[PDB]
Amino acid sequence: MAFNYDEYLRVDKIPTLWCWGCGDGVILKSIIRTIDALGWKMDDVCLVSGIGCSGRMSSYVNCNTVHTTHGRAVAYATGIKMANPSKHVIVVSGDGDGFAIGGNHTMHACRRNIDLNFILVNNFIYGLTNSQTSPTTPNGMWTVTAQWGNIDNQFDPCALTTAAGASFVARESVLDPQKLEKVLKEGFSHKGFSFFDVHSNCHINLGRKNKMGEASQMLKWMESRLVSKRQFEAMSPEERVDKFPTGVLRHDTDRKEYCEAYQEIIEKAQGKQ
């Protein structure tokens, strides 16, 4: 939560392993801070994460952690949460996870409204396997498998999850951790499927061939791409080319959680049939 981060960490694991300036330790810090701010106890928190570079996050925290196969974090988490419907489950995965190979699971988790806390670590390529193309890489960028310019198009995870039926959607980045923690603390207290789109930076594998090889050049580019929600909401469609609004984008309050309704089916299952 503060200068004492070691209550929530497997301190024998740190120093971490990412590169030197990846925007992944910032998200871990923010998660720990917002867990403390809410008064949660680490004997109630589980953290399941897919395979990739954001899959190292489930190694450093001191709780009941799981590391799953590629694209299946949300299904294991659904099972864990359904069998223990009183504890706090958090999912962490990349953009080549649950939006490329596991987009089906994410869409159906949004649809059926399971009380999860999906957190997407968006760095716009596949980092672990050395810079392949993602469903979120912008057009024209050099990737290892598109060496004349990427021509596939892009996903908008927020619009896609909104169309699927998520109850709490929000976007932030590692360029403002206080707002990141405010969004996380408002989304953790929600009682449906909460989706957080977090823009991270991959300067080693993405920006290195697009001339953003330093961390700060990538950070300034990412800042230029991001505008607030009302900034964006006022600009003209002439002007919203490659602009992303940040903040809370949807907080449906008249909704029903999945387990809260399966409990009703359970009660009328043999409440005298």
Partner: protein, 106 residues
């Protein structure tokens, strides 16, 4: 948290990504040359007396290296235009500390 130190850097955990440097508005941080490590550059505090309570450095540290004392047990400095000018002159210096800064070994 030792006494008087508004901010101190763990020379064993830092990796040299210049990010905590690029976010401080009081020009207190500076990157010097250290050949003992791989990257070569290491972060060292330069003017810890002009420290502002903003924890932006600790919030922008992906490697758990830089620390800042708590407001409850410390008195931080005030804002000044000389400090902001110094921060700008540090930023335009490849996030390294200025040649002028070595006058005392800052």
């Amino acid at each position: 948290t030792p006494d008087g130190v508004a901010v101190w850097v763990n020379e064993d955990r830092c990796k040299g990504c210049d990010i905590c440097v690029s976010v401080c508005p009081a020009g207190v941080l500076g990157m010097g040359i250290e050949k003992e490590r791989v990257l070569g550059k290491v972060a060292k505090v330069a003017y810890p007396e002009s420290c502002i309570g903003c924890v932006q450095c600790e919030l922008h540290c992906p490697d758990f290296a830089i620390y800042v004392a708590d407001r409850k047990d410390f008195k931080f400095a005030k804002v000044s235009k000389e400090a902001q000018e110094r921060s700008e002159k540090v930023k335009a210096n490849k996030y390294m500390l200025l040649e002028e800064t070595i006058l005392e070994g800052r």
